């Protein structure tokens, strides 16, 4: 967890989305105490190095910055939200909400595919992508 940095103001969130031109900006929105927001914080931290060349990761806490709760509508322990060139990206995991991510993904590998898929599709301006594995059943 101490690998991955944290964002302590909503102004750290916004500049961080802007200044990274060439890579995804992946953010976990959720709060330290949570059962499920700790688990994801692991599965990302392990992956963050492998992917440094196309994706950048950060951590944010709903309690630290609540400014973003209404606009993106944040419910539940945590939401993974992908950004490329200020454009909110979007993917269908078969789960019935195409915005963000909720459920906890299981393998390191299946997580890297999703990041890679989003980036590759995203690079072409495509706003939707399809997660190869569709965990509607899972979540």
């Amino acid at each position: 967890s101490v690998l991955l940095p944290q964002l302590r103001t909503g102004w750290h969130v916004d500049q961080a989305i802007v200044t990274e031109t060439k890579r995804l900006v992946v953010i976990r929105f959720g709060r330290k105490n949570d059962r499920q927001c700790m688990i994801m914080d692991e599965l990302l931290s392990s992956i963050a190095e492998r992917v440094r060349n196309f994706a950048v990761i950060y951590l944010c806490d709903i309690d630290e910055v609540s400014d973003f709760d209404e606009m993106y509508e944040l419910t539940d322990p945590m939401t993974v939200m992908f950004f490329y060139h200020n454009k909110h990206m979007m993917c269908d995991f078969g789960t019935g909400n195409n915005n963000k991510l909720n459920f906890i993904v299981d393998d390191k590998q299946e997580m890297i595919d999703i990041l890679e898929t989003i980036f590759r599709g995203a690079r072409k301006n495509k706003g939707l992508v399809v997660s190869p594995y569709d965990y509607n059943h899972k979540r």
Binding site: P5, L7, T9, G10, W11, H12, V13, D14, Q15, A16, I17, V18, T19, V65, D67, F68, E70, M71, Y72, E73, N86, H88, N99
Partner: protein
């Protein structure tokens, strides 16, 4: 992470700057009610915590001079070798379609080779039987051949022999009798061997060529 360092906003809202898109008495009474309910209504740390106090002692020089990155399984080397081993694939050769192998060709073909080396020094049972549709195809072609020449029994014995291998029995034995209808010796020779089984019948067949 240069921004991470800096720390100051303008007195600025987060949503607006980026260009963001989104994709009291009753209360008091409620609180009171809730209270009327609160009134009415770890282990790991304990295990360790006791050790953590134990640590306090350690000096700051020692905290520094701590060895930093020791691997004891050589995981990196093994992993790399594994990736290299698993990289590419290859296509399997064409000797491997499963149909061909007969041992008897194989031993005779080999053993001889081995012997030569020494001297110098000095159908498949797996396969599914012919589908009816496909067999029918063969029959048509052979019929066409036969019709093309009413003579030339070379095309007659083929229809008996090709048929015989694929099926035989009722069919071939009737054809070899049909095309037999005098001059060719070959037809007669063919006919007796397939058809005969029994001595009387063999004799009768023989009375044909003779």
């Amino acid at each position: 992470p240069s921004f991470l360092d800096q720390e100051p906003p303008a007195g600025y809202v987060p949503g607006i700057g980026r260009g963001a898109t989104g994709f009291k008495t009753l209360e008091l009474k409620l609180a009171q009610k809730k209270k009327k309910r609160a009134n009415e209504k770890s282990n790991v740390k304990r295990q360790f915590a006791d050790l953590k106090e134990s640590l306090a002692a350690v000096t700051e020089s020692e905290w520094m001079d701590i060895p930093d990155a020791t691997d004891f399984t050589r995981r990196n080397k093994r992993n790399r070798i594994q990736e290299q081993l698993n990289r590419k694939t290859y296509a399997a050769p064409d000797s491997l379609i499963p149909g061909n192998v007969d041992l008897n060709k194989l031993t005779e073909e080999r053993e001889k080779l081995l012997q030569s080396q020494i001297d110098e020094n000095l159908r498949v049972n797996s396969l599914s039987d012919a589908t009816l549709e496909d067999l029918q195809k063969m029959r048509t072609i052979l019929k066409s051949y036969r019709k093309a020449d009413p003579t030339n029994p070379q095309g007659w014995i083929a229809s008996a022999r090709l048929e015989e291998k694929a099926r035989k029995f009722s069919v071939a034995k009737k054809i070899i009798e049909n095309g037999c209808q005098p001059r060719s010796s070959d037809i007669w020779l063919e006919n007796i061997r397939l058809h005969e089984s029994d001595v009387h019948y063999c004799k009768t067949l023989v009375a044909t060529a003779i």
